[PDB]
Symmetry: C2
Subunit: 288 residues, 2 copies
Amino acid sequence: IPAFHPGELNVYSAPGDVADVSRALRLTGRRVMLVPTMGALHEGHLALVRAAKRVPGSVVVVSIFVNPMQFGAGGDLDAYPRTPDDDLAQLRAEGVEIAFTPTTAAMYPDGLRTTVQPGPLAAELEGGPRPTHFAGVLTVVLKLLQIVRPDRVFFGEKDYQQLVLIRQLVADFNLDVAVVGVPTVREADGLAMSSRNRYLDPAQRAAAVALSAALTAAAHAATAGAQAALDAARAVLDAAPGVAVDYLELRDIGLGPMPLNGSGRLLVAARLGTTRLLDNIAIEIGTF
Amino acid sequence: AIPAFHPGELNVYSAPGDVADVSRALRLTGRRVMLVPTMGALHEGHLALVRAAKRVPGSVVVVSIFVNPMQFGALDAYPRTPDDDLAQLRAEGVEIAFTPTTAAMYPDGLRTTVQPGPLAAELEGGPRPTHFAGVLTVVLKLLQIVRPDRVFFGEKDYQQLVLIRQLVADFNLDVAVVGVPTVREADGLAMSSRNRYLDPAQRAAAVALSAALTAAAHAATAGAQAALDAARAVLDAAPGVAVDYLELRDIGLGPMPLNGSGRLLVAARLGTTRLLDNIAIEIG
């Protein structure tokens, strides 16, 4: 079995090495926590890492893999930011003991053969412009969960639809893992942290505050009902320079075939130039 | 408090969480969990899977009995003999039977499912294009519920076996897949719950499938073409046997190599009953 140096960052690229080490750790009684990422780590990811680290007796595994299957054909895969050196430096500073950095060949030795087919939610919202996106996400997450076999897996609420779909995967395939959703980390003005924020020039960055301002205005207007909430958000978005809204939807919290009855989630997707930003917030209709 | 488990007796659990809990507890006690997935209506073919599982040192055998709606065509006619199935398992010394309801396996209906690779559209996938997605989806679920060290499948459903091996490799599953040789009647007919539907004329003609395959296996010293031609000749000597396919492939069901190990598969309809068989072939 590959060496593991306690209290230091151990980097493994072979799926078999991390599987062997994770198993050995679990057998000694350490609880394995998994934070799946595509690198280009920011404070939002660090919040996931810290949530994992606080679980008593845990050992944290952060996977970094820019999964080709979740990118739609075009230049998106090549355009994804890659900052490997900064990513590992941040994991070392956070006290993470395991980084799993597999190659494309090790993850997809047989190309796209057996894959995960998500439920109907994968075709909506983000699945509109990217129809095969979530099958890519669920397939890689299922594989990472089988490789690492964590007790808990951490995902951010920022990518809410993804989080809901991962909970569906876990329930539907009877996976023995706890899915932990971590609250969205935001800049001082409210902008949700994202690796795509680096593509906002100064003006677009100023204008981008409208997504969070619209959502938070809606959450408070919600005491007056769904129409008030949606219209408050639309007014903020309509007053924002250079913000092109793709969708603004208020749905039941499970985003499924259920109507909004009290508790919901308000989701927005907008483009600033070529940069597509997403944000979402909890909404409680009629609650002050 | 983990549910109760009585060593040496057949412990029947219908709730997924219960068998999940018991399997985990037994694994920690020094037992190796062996899973034998079935749809009930057990016969000697299934007992051979049970016996293969039981022989592993430290084994605790879990036989699942679940008529999976997802692998049926677009069900109620499927043989269901609960008390008798359990009686057979009891006689074999099986300690765990998992008998879930459809609602328990699919509490949210069909939502997230497994999409097989292209092999699922070939051979058996011709007539039943959604069949293997149903099989892999339920098998993945059973593997996650039970978390067995080894899972056993019969070679009679060879394409199913190959697809399960693809599922395990593709999803990085930590389970060993064990294929068990086909159990056959005295004249070679592969055992199947469908054999009883054959009338006398059909039952006599059905021997042609196995006879065609064994003839091919021996004709193979003369090449792939000789093997295929010998099998076709045997099938052609039988009345009322509508051959759906007779194909020679490599062991993973890809194209058959110039020479080496392969698998010959046949499927045919006798009246309204569809029969399948297959055999290892060594070319040359």
